[PDB]
Amino acid sequence: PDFGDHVDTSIFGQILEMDEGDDHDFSAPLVLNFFEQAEETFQKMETALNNKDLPELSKLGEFLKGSSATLGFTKIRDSCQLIQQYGHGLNVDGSSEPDEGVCLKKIAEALASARVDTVALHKMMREFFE
């Protein structure tokens, strides 16, 4: 399976080992569970944006970063890392960003990237598991 930059094959590959037989009896429910979880998190983020709660956004980013990391979903993990950082009021270089308005705008961009990358991956994973 050639998922491009979306998936770390060395990590995802280890998920696939847990399948007994060729029906993907373990990996497929797991991946499904991740997309549901992601979808829930994105909704809770979309609300957190609406209420301009930067700490919440930071934590949701960190949470979803961790679960995408576990499965090797690199592009999603990265965008969630940015949400974590911008939620703590920091730029990519580590310098502080004191303008909340700027932070929120950067989070919005990274949330859009995350959602789009999730959808892209969901499709490929659907092709893969059929």
Author numbering: 44 to 173
Tell me, in the authors' exact words, what the paper reports.
If the HK incorporates a REC domain (REC-1) is denoted as hybrid histidine kinase (hHK), and the first His-Asp phosphotransfer event occurs in the same polypeptide chain. Then, HPt protein containing a phosphorylatable His shuffles the phosphoryl group from the phosphorylatable Asp in the REC-1 domain to the phosphorylatable Asp in the REC domain of an RR (REC-2) in two more phosphotransfer steps. In fungi, the HPt accepts the phosphoryl group from REC-1 domains of various hHKs upstream of the signaling pathway and forwards it downstream to REC-2 domains present in at least two conserved RRs, Ssk1 and Skn7. Also, we have obtained the crystal structures of Ct_HPt alone and in complex with REChHK6 bound to the phosphomimetic BeF3−, as well as the crystal structures of REChHK3 and RECCa_Sln1.
To assess that phosphotransfer from REC-1 domains was being carried out on the phosphorylatable H105 of Ct_HPt, we generated the mutant H105E and conducted phosphotransfer experiments with REChHK6 and REChHK3 in the presence of PAM. The absence of electrophoretic mobility shift for the Ct_HPt mutant H105E in the presence of PAM, compared to WT, alone or upon incubation with the REC-1 domains indicated the absence of phosphotransfer and confirmed H105 as the only nucleophilic residue to become phosphorylated. We determined the structure of the phosphomutant Ct_HPt H105E at 2.4 Å which showed a similar structure than Ct_HPt in the complex (rmsd of 0.7 Å for 125 residues). However, the superposition of the phosphomutant to the complex showed few clashes with residues of REChHK6 involved in complex interactions, thus, supporting that subtle changes in the side chain conformation of a few residues could prevent phosphotransfer. In relation to HPt, we have observed subtle changes in the phosphomimetic mutant H105E.
